Amino acid sequence: MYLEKLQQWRYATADFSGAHITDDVLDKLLNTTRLTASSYGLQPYCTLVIRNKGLREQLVNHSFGQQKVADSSALVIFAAKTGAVADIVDPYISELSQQRQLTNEEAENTRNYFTQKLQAMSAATRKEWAVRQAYIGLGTFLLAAAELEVDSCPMEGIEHDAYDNILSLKDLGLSTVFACPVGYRSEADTTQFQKKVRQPLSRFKVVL
Amino acid sequence: MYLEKLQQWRYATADFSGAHITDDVLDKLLNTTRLTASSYGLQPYCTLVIRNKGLREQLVNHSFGQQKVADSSALVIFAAKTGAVADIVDPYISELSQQRQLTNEEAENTRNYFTQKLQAMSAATRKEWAVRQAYIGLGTFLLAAAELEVDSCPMEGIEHDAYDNILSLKDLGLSTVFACPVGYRSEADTTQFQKKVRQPLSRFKVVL
Ligand SMILES: Cc1cc2nc3c(=O)[nH]c(=O)nc-3n(C[C@H](O)[C@H](O)[C@H](O)COP(=O)(O)O)c2cc1C
Ligand SMILES: Cc1cc2nc3c(=O)[nH]c(=O)nc-3n(C[C@H](O)[C@H](O)[C@H](O)COP(=O)(O)O)c2cc1C
């Protein structure tokens, strides 16, 4: 399978070159990510793009000294929607309305249905629900990056609240879930030649 | 991009046909899914495969009557490792040691590194950590299914504790995360013809 070949090409890049990543490439990567399935189709997360070097150097200090946060072409941050329920529901209803040519009443009934269902969860449960959806997105993103021969590294090893504070995400109703520097591996990154370690299928598949 | 085409081909299948999915196809799907990146490469989850029709009709009764759980050719359940820390760490070290040819000393030091790390998490925290990894694997699985032109539907609308009871998962140190019937859509599924709804790139991508 092609996706198996993509799985073998990618790796958790340790050292990036100084090569630039174009906006066209990053847009292709995030456009493919955008089409990922989500719970109820609500897509309760987004992808932030940061290139500014100064800002990213600040994030290194809140990424346990992991320099690749800044020393890469760009940084993508996946952020969950953790603010007003309306910021999750309304943008979906607008798209649903337009795409499915719904009547005003039908749109309002769907808006109500999802608003009530999300309000039924606690803030904590809703946040983790959103976080989970973003992890599905990461799965897409890692393969989309491989198709484009774009290197990356997913990073949970960051100070989440510090990222949120530094980037003022609170006024956007967002919460950092994980970060992914993107770019092109350094010639000098010897970790690209380590053999991949994965569960064999005899352990990963359990027939009941 | 090819992965864009896969995204457009797939959908959350509402009505499955009774057509057989072969083991060779299901194995290609799970083999691609098994190569998914995970936090520390520890892959703290697995996929359970169930075909038994009556067992699944029972799971239907704990899935708010979503008959697709039984109607499909097979059911794949993503299950997080929620038992002994050793059952996450040891299988990793075994594969790591074999693939990268570690000395006994290095393998033990690395085992000890991971056991310490996982034990520092509360049981709840470690469980949700593992759950998050499984959601990355779902992202891969949805695209792998698309590449094989296998239909699927991810499913969180299940009674999770009932699934674990019914399937005896506590004894295996596993917790149901979500379920995914797999097979081939029925021509009678009218939802396959509906326009796919996703929020536009202008909202999904926020450039800081
Ligand atoms: C959710 C997630 C978080 C990760 N966090 C970090 C991180 O903070 N820093 C880092 O260098 N690698 C991080 N990794 C990279 C993993 O260590 C790597 O994916 C795993 O060992 C599998 O190897 P491969 O991706 O190179 O094929 C993370 C990976 C995932 C999936
Ligand atoms: C994590 C997750 C859980 C889902 N749970 C269910 C479910 O329990 N039952 C169902 O019919 N669809 C379920 N869906 C399907 C979504 O409703 C569907 O993915 C979404 O509306 C986007 O449309 P598409 O997948 O057809 O492109 C789930 C999807 C995801 C990603």
CSV table of C-alpha atoms and ligand atoms in Angstrom, one decimal:
chain,number,residue,atom,x,y,z
A,1,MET,CA,0.0,0.0,0.0
A,2,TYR,CA,1.0,3.6,-0.6
A,3,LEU,CA,0.1,4.6,2.9
A,4,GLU,CA,2.6,1.9,4.2
A,5,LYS,CA,5.3,3.5,2.1
A,6,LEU,CA,4.4,6.9,3.6
A,7,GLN,CA,4.6,5.4,7.1
A,8,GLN,CA,8.1,4.1,6.4
A,9,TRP,CA,9.4,7.4,5.0
A,10,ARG,CA,8.3,9.7,7.9
A,11,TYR,CA,10.0,9.8,11.2
A,12,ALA,CA,10.1,12.0,14.4
A,13,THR,CA,12.6,14.5,13.0
A,14,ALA,CA,15.3,15.5,15.4
A,15,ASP,CA,17.2,18.1,13.3
A,16,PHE,CA,15.8,20.3,10.6
A,17,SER,CA,17.7,22.1,7.8
A,18,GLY,CA,17.4,25.9,7.2
A,19,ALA,CA,15.3,25.2,4.1
A,20,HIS,CA,12.1,27.3,3.8
A,21,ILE,CA,8.7,25.6,3.5
A,22,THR,CA,6.4,27.4,1.1
A,23,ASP,CA,2.9,28.6,1.9
A,24,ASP,CA,1.5,26.4,-1.0
A,25,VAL,CA,3.0,23.3,0.6
A,26,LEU,CA,1.8,24.1,4.1
A,27,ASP,CA,-1.6,24.9,2.7
A,28,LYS,CA,-1.8,21.5,1.0
A,29,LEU,CA,-0.7,19.8,4.3
A,30,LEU,CA,-3.3,21.7,6.4
A,31,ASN,CA,-6.0,21.3,3.7
A,32,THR,CA,-5.6,17.6,3.8
A,33,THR,CA,-5.7,17.7,7.6
A,34,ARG,CA,-8.9,19.8,7.5
A,35,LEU,CA,-10.8,17.0,5.7
A,36,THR,CA,-10.3,14.7,8.7
A,37,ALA,CA,-13.4,13.0,10.2
A,38,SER,CA,-14.5,14.3,13.6
A,39,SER,CA,-17.1,13.5,16.2
A,40,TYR,CA,-20.5,14.7,14.9
A,41,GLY,CA,-18.5,16.5,12.2
A,42,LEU,CA,-17.9,19.3,14.7
A,43,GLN,CA,-14.2,19.7,14.1
A,44,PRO,CA,-13.6,21.2,17.5
A,45,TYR,CA,-9.9,22.2,16.9
A,46,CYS,CA,-7.8,24.2,14.5
A,47,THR,CA,-4.2,24.4,13.4
A,48,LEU,CA,-2.2,27.5,14.2
A,49,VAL,CA,0.8,28.4,12.0
A,50,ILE,CA,3.8,30.4,13.5
A,51,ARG,CA,6.9,31.3,11.5
A,52,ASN,CA,8.2,34.3,13.6
A,53,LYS,CA,11.6,33.3,14.9
A,54,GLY,CA,11.5,35.4,18.1
A,55,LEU,CA,8.1,34.0,19.2
A,56,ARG,CA,9.3,30.5,18.6
A,57,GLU,CA,12.5,31.0,20.5
A,58,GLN,CA,10.3,31.9,23.5
A,59,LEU,CA,8.4,28.6,23.0
A,60,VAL,CA,11.7,26.6,23.1
A,61,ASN,CA,12.1,27.8,26.7
A,62,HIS,CA,8.7,26.3,27.4
A,63,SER,CA,9.4,23.1,25.4
A,64,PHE,CA,12.1,21.7,27.7
A,65,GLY,CA,14.9,23.2,25.6
A,66,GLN,CA,13.8,21.4,22.5
A,67,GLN,CA,15.4,23.7,19.9
A,68,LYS,CA,13.6,22.2,16.9
A,69,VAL,CA,10.5,24.2,18.0
A,70,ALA,CA,12.2,27.2,16.5
A,71,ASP,CA,14.9,25.6,14.3
A,72,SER,CA,12.5,24.4,11.6
A,73,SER,CA,10.8,26.1,8.6
A,74,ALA,CA,7.5,26.7,10.5
A,75,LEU,CA,5.6,25.5,13.5
A,76,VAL,CA,2.1,24.1,13.5
A,77,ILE,CA,0.2,23.9,16.8
A,78,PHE,CA,-3.0,21.9,17.1
A,79,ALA,CA,-5.3,23.8,19.4
A,80,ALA,CA,-8.7,22.5,20.8
A,81,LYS,CA,-11.7,24.7,21.0
A,82,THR,CA,-12.2,25.2,24.8
A,83,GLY,CA,-14.2,28.4,24.9
A,84,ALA,CA,-17.8,29.2,24.1
A,85,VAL,CA,-19.9,26.3,22.8
A,86,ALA,CA,-21.1,28.6,20.1
A,87,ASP,CA,-17.6,28.9,18.7
A,88,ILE,CA,-17.8,25.1,18.0
A,89,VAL,CA,-21.4,24.9,16.9
A,90,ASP,CA,-22.1,28.0,14.8
A,91,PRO,CA,-19.2,27.6,12.2
A,92,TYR,CA,-20.4,24.0,11.6
A,93,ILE,CA,-24.1,25.0,11.1
A,94,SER,CA,-23.0,27.7,8.6
A,95,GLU,CA,-21.1,25.2,6.5
A,96,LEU,CA,-23.8,22.5,6.9
A,97,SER,CA,-26.5,25.1,5.9
A,98,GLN,CA,-24.6,26.1,2.8
A,99,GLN,CA,-23.5,22.6,1.8
A,100,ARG,CA,-26.8,20.8,2.4
A,101,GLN,CA,-29.0,23.8,1.4
A,102,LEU,CA,-31.0,23.6,4.7
A,103,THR,CA,-34.0,25.9,5.5
A,104,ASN,CA,-33.6,28.5,8.3
A,105,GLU,CA,-35.7,26.4,10.7
A,106,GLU,CA,-33.8,23.1,10.0
A,107,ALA,CA,-30.5,25.0,10.6
A,108,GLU,CA,-31.8,26.3,13.9
A,109,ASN,CA,-33.0,22.9,15.0
A,110,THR,CA,-29.6,21.4,14.3
A,111,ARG,CA,-27.9,24.3,16.0
A,112,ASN,CA,-30.1,23.6,19.1
A,113,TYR,CA,-29.4,19.9,19.0
A,114,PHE,CA,-25.6,20.3,19.1
A,115,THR,CA,-25.7,23.2,21.5
A,116,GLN,CA,-27.7,21.2,24.0
A,117,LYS,CA,-25.5,18.1,23.5
A,118,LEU,CA,-22.2,20.0,24.1
A,119,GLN,CA,-23.7,22.0,27.0
A,120,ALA,CA,-24.6,18.6,28.6
A,121,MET,CA,-20.9,17.8,28.9
A,122,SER,CA,-18.9,19.5,31.7
A,123,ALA,CA,-16.2,22.0,30.5
A,124,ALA,CA,-13.5,19.3,31.3
A,125,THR,CA,-15.3,16.5,29.4
A,126,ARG,CA,-15.9,18.8,26.4
A,127,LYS,CA,-12.3,19.9,26.3
A,128,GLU,CA,-11.0,16.3,26.3
A,129,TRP,CA,-13.6,15.4,23.7
A,130,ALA,CA,-12.2,18.2,21.5
A,131,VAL,CA,-8.6,17.1,22.3
A,132,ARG,CA,-9.3,13.6,21.1
A,133,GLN,CA,-10.6,14.9,17.8
A,134,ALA,CA,-7.4,16.8,17.3
A,135,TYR,CA,-5.4,13.6,17.8
A,136,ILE,CA,-7.3,12.1,14.8
A,137,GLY,CA,-6.2,15.1,12.9
A,138,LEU,CA,-2.5,14.5,13.8
A,139,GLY,CA,-2.8,11.0,12.2
A,140,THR,CA,-3.9,12.6,9.0
A,141,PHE,CA,-1.2,15.3,9.2
A,142,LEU,CA,1.7,12.9,9.7
A,143,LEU,CA,0.7,11.0,6.5
A,144,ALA,CA,0.0,14.2,4.6
A,145,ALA,CA,3.4,15.5,5.5
A,146,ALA,CA,4.9,12.2,4.3
A,147,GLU,CA,3.1,12.5,0.9
A,148,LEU,CA,4.6,16.0,0.5
A,149,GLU,CA,8.0,14.8,1.6
A,150,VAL,CA,7.8,17.3,4.4
A,151,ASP,CA,9.5,16.3,7.7
A,152,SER,CA,8.0,17.0,11.0
A,153,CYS,CA,8.0,15.9,14.6
A,154,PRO,CA,4.9,15.7,16.9
A,155,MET,CA,5.6,17.2,20.3
A,156,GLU,CA,3.6,16.6,23.5
A,157,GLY,CA,6.8,17.5,25.5
A,158,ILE,CA,5.7,21.2,25.9
A,159,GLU,CA,4.3,23.4,28.6
A,160,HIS,CA,0.7,23.6,27.5
A,161,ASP,CA,-0.5,26.4,29.7
A,162,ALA,CA,2.7,28.5,29.0
A,163,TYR,CA,2.1,28.1,25.2
A,164,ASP,CA,-1.5,29.3,25.8
A,165,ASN,CA,-0.3,32.3,27.8
A,166,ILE,CA,2.5,33.2,25.4
A,167,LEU,CA,0.2,33.0,22.3
A,168,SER,CA,-2.8,34.6,24.2
A,169,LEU,CA,-5.0,31.7,23.1
A,170,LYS,CA,-7.4,32.3,25.9
A,171,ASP,CA,-9.1,35.2,24.1
A,172,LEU,CA,-9.5,32.9,21.1
A,173,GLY,CA,-11.1,30.1,23.1
A,174,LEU,CA,-8.3,27.8,22.2
A,175,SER,CA,-6.0,25.4,24.1
A,176,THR,CA,-2.7,24.0,22.8
A,177,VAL,CA,-2.9,20.2,22.4
A,178,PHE,CA,0.5,19.5,20.8
A,179,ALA,CA,3.0,21.2,18.5
A,180,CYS,CA,4.6,20.0,15.2
A,181,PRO,CA,7.5,21.8,13.7
A,182,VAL,CA,7.6,21.2,9.9
A,183,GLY,CA,10.4,21.5,7.4
A,184,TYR,CA,13.1,19.3,5.8
A,185,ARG,CA,15.4,17.0,7.7
A,186,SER,CA,19.0,18.0,8.2
A,187,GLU,CA,21.6,15.9,6.2
A,188,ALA,CA,23.2,15.6,9.7
A,189,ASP,CA,20.2,14.1,11.4
A,190,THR,CA,21.5,10.6,12.0
A,191,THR,CA,18.3,9.5,13.7
A,192,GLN,CA,16.6,9.2,10.3
A,193,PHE,CA,18.8,6.0,9.9
A,194,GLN,CA,17.5,4.3,13.1
A,195,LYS,CA,15.3,1.2,12.4
A,196,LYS,CA,11.6,1.9,13.1
A,197,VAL,CA,10.1,0.2,16.1
A,198,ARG,CA,6.5,-0.9,16.0
A,199,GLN,CA,4.3,-3.6,17.6
A,200,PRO,CA,4.2,-6.6,15.2
A,201,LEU,CA,0.8,-7.4,13.8
A,202,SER,CA,0.6,-10.6,15.9
A,203,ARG,CA,0.5,-8.4,19.0
A,204,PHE,CA,-1.3,-5.4,17.6
A,205,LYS,CA,-4.2,-7.4,16.1
A,206,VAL,CA,-6.2,-9.4,18.7
A,207,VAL,CA,-8.8,-11.7,17.3
A,208,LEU,CA,-11.7,-12.2,19.6
B,1,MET,CA,-2.7,15.1,-3.4
B,2,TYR,CA,-3.7,11.4,-3.2
B,3,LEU,CA,-4.6,11.7,0.5
B,4,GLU,CA,-7.1,14.4,-0.5
B,5,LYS,CA,-8.8,12.0,-2.8
B,6,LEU,CA,-8.9,9.3,-0.1
B,7,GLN,CA,-10.5,11.9,2.3
B,8,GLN,CA,-13.2,12.7,-0.3
B,9,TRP,CA,-13.8,9.0,-1.0
B,10,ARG,CA,-14.4,7.9,2.6
B,11,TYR,CA,-17.5,8.7,4.7
B,12,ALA,CA,-19.0,7.6,8.0
B,13,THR,CA,-21.0,4.7,6.5
B,14,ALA,CA,-24.6,4.5,7.8
B,15,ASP,CA,-25.7,1.3,6.2
B,16,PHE,CA,-23.3,-1.6,5.5
B,17,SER,CA,-23.9,-4.4,3.1
B,18,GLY,CA,-23.5,-8.1,4.0
B,19,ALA,CA,-20.5,-8.4,1.6
B,20,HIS,CA,-17.4,-10.3,3.1
B,21,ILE,CA,-14.2,-8.4,3.9
B,22,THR,CA,-11.3,-10.9,3.7
B,23,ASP,CA,-8.6,-11.4,6.3
B,24,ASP,CA,-5.9,-10.3,3.9
B,25,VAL,CA,-7.7,-7.0,3.3
B,26,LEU,CA,-8.3,-6.5,7.1
B,27,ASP,CA,-4.7,-7.3,7.7
B,28,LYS,CA,-3.4,-4.7,5.2
B,29,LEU,CA,-5.7,-2.2,7.0
B,30,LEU,CA,-4.4,-3.1,10.5
B,31,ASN,CA,-0.8,-3.4,9.3
B,32,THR,CA,-0.8,0.2,8.0
B,33,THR,CA,-2.6,1.3,11.2
B,34,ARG,CA,0.1,-0.5,13.3
B,35,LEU,CA,2.9,1.7,11.8
B,36,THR,CA,1.3,4.9,13.3
B,37,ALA,CA,3.5,7.2,15.4
B,38,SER,CA,2.8,7.3,19.1
B,39,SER,CA,4.0,9.1,22.2
B,40,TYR,CA,7.5,7.7,23.0
B,41,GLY,CA,6.8,5.0,20.4
B,42,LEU,CA,5.0,3.0,23.2
B,43,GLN,CA,1.8,2.4,21.2
B,44,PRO,CA,-0.4,1.8,24.3
B,45,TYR,CA,-3.3,0.3,22.4
B,46,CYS,CA,-4.4,-2.4,20.1
B,47,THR,CA,-7.2,-3.3,17.7
B,48,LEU,CA,-9.6,-6.1,18.5
B,49,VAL,CA,-11.3,-7.8,15.5
B,50,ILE,CA,-14.8,-9.4,15.9
B,51,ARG,CA,-16.9,-11.1,13.2
B,52,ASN,CA,-19.4,-13.1,15.4
B,53,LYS,CA,-22.8,-11.9,14.5
B,54,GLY,CA,-24.7,-12.6,17.8
B,55,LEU,CA,-22.1,-11.0,20.1
B,56,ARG,CA,-22.3,-7.9,18.0
B,57,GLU,CA,-26.1,-7.8,18.0
B,58,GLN,CA,-25.6,-7.7,21.7
B,59,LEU,CA,-23.1,-4.8,21.4
B,60,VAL,CA,-25.8,-3.1,19.3
B,61,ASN,CA,-28.1,-3.1,22.3
B,62,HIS,CA,-25.3,-1.2,24.1
B,63,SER,CA,-24.7,1.2,21.1
B,64,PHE,CA,-28.0,3.1,21.3
B,65,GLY,CA,-29.4,0.7,18.7
B,66,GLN,CA,-26.9,1.5,16.0
B,67,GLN,CA,-27.3,-1.7,13.9
B,68,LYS,CA,-24.2,-1.0,11.8
B,69,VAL,CA,-22.1,-2.6,14.6
B,70,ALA,CA,-23.6,-6.1,13.7
B,71,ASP,CA,-24.5,-5.6,10.0
B,72,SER,CA,-20.9,-5.0,8.8
B,73,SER,CA,-18.6,-7.8,7.8
B,74,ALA,CA,-16.2,-7.2,10.8
B,75,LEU,CA,-15.9,-4.9,13.8
B,76,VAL,CA,-12.6,-3.4,14.8
B,77,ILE,CA,-12.4,-2.1,18.4
B,78,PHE,CA,-9.6,0.2,19.3
B,79,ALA,CA,-8.7,-0.7,22.9
B,80,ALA,CA,-6.3,1.3,25.2
B,81,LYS,CA,-3.9,-0.6,27.5
B,82,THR,CA,-5.2,0.3,31.0
B,83,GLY,CA,-3.7,-2.5,33.1
B,84,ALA,CA,-0.2,-3.1,34.4
B,85,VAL,CA,2.4,-0.6,33.2
B,86,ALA,CA,4.6,-3.6,32.4
B,87,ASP,CA,2.1,-4.6,29.6
B,88,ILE,CA,2.9,-1.3,27.8
B,89,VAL,CA,6.6,-1.1,28.6
B,90,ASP,CA,7.8,-4.7,28.1
B,91,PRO,CA,6.5,-5.3,24.6
B,92,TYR,CA,8.1,-2.1,23.5
B,93,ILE,CA,11.5,-3.0,25.0
B,94,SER,CA,11.3,-6.4,23.4
B,95,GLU,CA,10.8,-5.0,19.9
B,96,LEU,CA,13.3,-2.1,20.5
B,97,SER,CA,16.0,-4.5,21.6
B,98,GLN,CA,15.5,-6.8,18.7
B,99,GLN,CA,15.4,-4.0,16.0
B,100,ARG,CA,18.2,-1.8,17.3
B,101,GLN,CA,20.3,-4.6,18.8
B,102,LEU,CA,20.6,-3.1,22.3
B,103,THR,CA,22.8,-4.6,25.0
B,104,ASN,CA,21.0,-6.1,28.0
B,105,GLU,CA,22.2,-3.1,30.0
B,106,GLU,CA,20.7,-0.6,27.6
B,107,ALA,CA,17.4,-2.5,27.3
B,108,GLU,CA,17.1,-2.6,31.2
B,109,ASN,CA,18.0,1.1,31.5
B,110,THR,CA,15.4,2.0,28.9
B,111,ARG,CA,12.8,-0.3,30.5
B,112,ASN,CA,13.5,1.4,33.8
B,113,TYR,CA,13.2,4.8,32.2
B,114,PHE,CA,9.8,4.1,30.8
B,115,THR,CA,8.4,2.3,33.9
B,116,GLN,CA,9.3,5.3,36.0
B,117,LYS,CA,7.7,7.7,33.6
B,118,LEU,CA,4.4,5.8,33.3
B,119,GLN,CA,4.2,5.2,37.0
B,120,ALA,CA,4.6,8.9,37.7
B,121,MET,CA,1.2,9.4,35.9
B,122,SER,CA,-2.0,8.6,37.8
B,123,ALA,CA,-4.0,5.7,36.5
B,124,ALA,CA,-6.6,8.1,35.0
B,125,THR,CA,-3.9,10.3,33.4
B,126,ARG,CA,-2.1,7.3,31.9
B,127,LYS,CA,-5.4,5.9,30.6
B,128,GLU,CA,-6.3,9.2,28.8
B,129,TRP,CA,-2.7,9.3,27.5
B,130,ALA,CA,-3.2,5.9,25.9
B,131,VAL,CA,-6.6,6.9,24.6
B,132,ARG,CA,-5.1,9.9,22.8
B,133,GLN,CA,-2.6,7.6,21.0
B,134,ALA,CA,-5.4,5.4,19.8
B,135,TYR,CA,-7.1,8.5,18.2
B,136,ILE,CA,-3.9,9.0,16.2
B,137,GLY,CA,-4.2,5.4,15.0
B,138,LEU,CA,-7.9,6.1,14.0
B,139,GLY,CA,-6.7,8.9,11.7
B,140,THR,CA,-4.4,6.4,10.0
B,141,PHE,CA,-7.1,3.7,9.9
B,142,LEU,CA,-9.7,5.9,8.2
B,143,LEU,CA,-7.2,6.7,5.3
B,144,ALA,CA,-5.9,3.1,5.1
B,145,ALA,CA,-9.6,2.0,4.7
B,146,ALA,CA,-10.1,4.6,2.0
B,147,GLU,CA,-7.0,3.4,0.1
B,148,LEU,CA,-8.4,-0.2,0.2
B,149,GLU,CA,-11.9,1.1,-0.8
B,150,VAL,CA,-13.2,-0.4,2.5
B,151,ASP,CA,-16.0,1.3,4.1
B,152,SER,CA,-16.0,2.1,7.8
B,153,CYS,CA,-17.7,4.2,10.5
B,154,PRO,CA,-15.9,5.4,13.7
B,155,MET,CA,-18.1,5.1,16.7
B,156,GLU,CA,-18.0,6.8,20.1
B,157,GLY,CA,-21.7,6.4,20.7
B,158,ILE,CA,-21.3,3.2,22.5
B,159,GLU,CA,-21.6,2.3,26.2
B,160,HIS,CA,-18.0,1.9,26.9
B,161,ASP,CA,-18.2,0.1,30.3
B,162,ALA,CA,-20.7,-2.4,28.8
B,163,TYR,CA,-18.4,-3.2,25.9
B,164,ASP,CA,-15.6,-4.0,28.3
B,165,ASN,CA,-17.9,-6.1,30.5
B,166,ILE,CA,-19.4,-8.0,27.5
B,167,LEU,CA,-16.0,-8.6,25.9
B,168,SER,CA,-14.1,-9.4,29.2
B,169,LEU,CA,-11.6,-6.7,28.6
B,170,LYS,CA,-10.6,-6.0,32.2
B,171,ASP,CA,-9.0,-9.4,32.3
B,172,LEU,CA,-6.8,-8.5,29.3
B,173,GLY,CA,-5.9,-5.0,30.8
B,174,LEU,CA,-7.8,-3.2,28.0
B,175,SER,CA,-10.5,-0.5,27.8
B,176,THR,CA,-12.7,0.2,24.8
B,177,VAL,CA,-12.0,3.6,23.2
B,178,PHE,CA,-14.2,3.5,20.1
B,179,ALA,CA,-15.5,0.9,17.6
B,180,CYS,CA,-15.2,0.8,13.8
B,181,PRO,CA,-17.4,-1.5,11.7
B,182,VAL,CA,-15.7,-2.3,8.4
B,183,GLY,CA,-16.9,-3.8,5.2
B,184,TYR,CA,-18.6,-2.5,2.1
B,185,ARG,CA,-21.4,0.1,2.0
B,186,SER,CA,-24.9,-0.9,0.8
B,187,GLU,CA,-26.2,0.9,-2.3
B,188,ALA,CA,-29.2,1.6,-0.1
B,189,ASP,CA,-27.1,4.0,2.1
B,190,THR,CA,-28.4,7.4,0.9
B,191,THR,CA,-25.9,9.3,3.1
B,192,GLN,CA,-23.1,8.4,0.7
B,193,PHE,CA,-24.5,10.8,-1.9
B,194,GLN,CA,-24.6,13.8,0.5
B,195,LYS,CA,-22.1,16.7,0.2
B,196,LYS,CA,-19.3,16.3,2.7
B,197,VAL,CA,-19.2,19.2,5.3
B,198,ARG,CA,-15.9,20.6,6.6
B,199,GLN,CA,-15.0,24.0,7.8
B,200,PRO,CA,-13.1,26.0,5.3
B,201,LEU,CA,-9.3,26.4,5.4
B,202,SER,CA,-9.8,30.1,6.3
B,203,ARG,CA,-11.2,29.0,9.7
B,204,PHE,CA,-9.2,25.8,10.2
B,205,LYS,CA,-5.8,27.4,9.7
B,206,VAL,CA,-5.1,30.4,11.9
B,207,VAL,CA,-1.8,32.1,11.0
B,208,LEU,CA,-0.4,33.9,14.0
C,1,LIG,C1,1.7,12.4,20.4
C,1,LIG,C2,3.1,12.4,20.2
C,1,LIG,C3,4.0,13.2,21.0
C,1,LIG,C4,5.3,13.2,20.8
C,1,LIG,N1,6.1,14.1,21.6
C,1,LIG,C5,7.4,14.3,21.3
C,1,LIG,C6,8.2,15.3,21.8
C,1,LIG,O1,7.8,16.2,22.6
C,1,LIG,N2,9.5,15.4,21.4
C,1,LIG,C7,10.1,14.6,20.5
C,1,LIG,O2,11.3,14.7,20.2
C,1,LIG,N3,9.3,13.5,20.0
C,1,LIG,C8,8.0,13.4,20.4
C,1,LIG,N4,7.3,12.3,19.8
C,1,LIG,C9,8.0,11.5,18.7
C,1,LIG,C10,7.8,10.0,19.1
C,1,LIG,O3,8.9,9.9,20.0
C,1,LIG,C11,8.0,9.1,17.9
C,1,LIG,O4,6.8,9.3,17.1
C,1,LIG,C12,7.9,7.5,18.1
C,1,LIG,O5,9.1,7.1,18.8
C,1,LIG,C13,7.8,6.7,16.8
C,1,LIG,O6,8.9,6.8,16.0
C,1,LIG,P1,8.9,7.5,14.5
C,1,LIG,O7,7.8,8.6,14.6
C,1,LIG,O8,10.2,8.2,14.4
C,1,LIG,O9,8.5,6.6,13.4
C,1,LIG,C14,5.9,12.4,19.9
C,1,LIG,C15,5.1,11.5,19.1
C,1,LIG,C16,3.7,11.5,19.3
C,1,LIG,C17,2.8,10.7,18.4
C,2,LIG,C1,-14.3,9.8,16.9
C,2,LIG,C2,-15.6,9.7,16.0
C,2,LIG,C3,-16.7,9.1,16.6
C,2,LIG,C4,-17.9,9.0,15.8
C,2,LIG,N1,-19.1,8.4,16.4
C,2,LIG,C5,-20.1,8.0,15.6
C,2,LIG,C6,-21.1,7.2,16.0
C,2,LIG,O1,-21.1,6.7,17.2
C,2,LIG,N2,-22.1,6.8,15.2
C,2,LIG,C7,-22.1,7.3,13.9
C,2,LIG,O2,-23.1,6.9,13.1
C,2,LIG,N3,-21.2,8.1,13.4
C,2,LIG,C8,-20.1,8.5,14.2
C,2,LIG,N4,-19.1,9.3,13.8
C,2,LIG,C9,-19.2,9.7,12.3
C,2,LIG,C10,-19.2,11.3,12.2
C,2,LIG,O3,-20.5,11.7,12.4
C,2,LIG,C11,-18.6,11.7,10.8
C,2,LIG,O4,-17.3,11.3,10.7
C,2,LIG,C12,-18.7,13.2,10.6
C,2,LIG,O5,-20.1,13.6,10.6
C,2,LIG,C13,-17.9,13.7,9.3
C,2,LIG,O6,-18.5,13.2,8.1
C,2,LIG,P1,-17.8,12.0,7.2
C,2,LIG,O7,-17.0,11.1,8.2
C,2,LIG,O8,-18.9,11.2,6.6
C,2,LIG,O9,-17.0,12.6,6.2
C,2,LIG,C14,-18.0,9.5,14.5
C,2,LIG,C15,-16.8,10.0,14.0
C,2,LIG,C16,-15.6,10.2,14.7
C,2,LIG,C17,-14.4,10.8,14.1
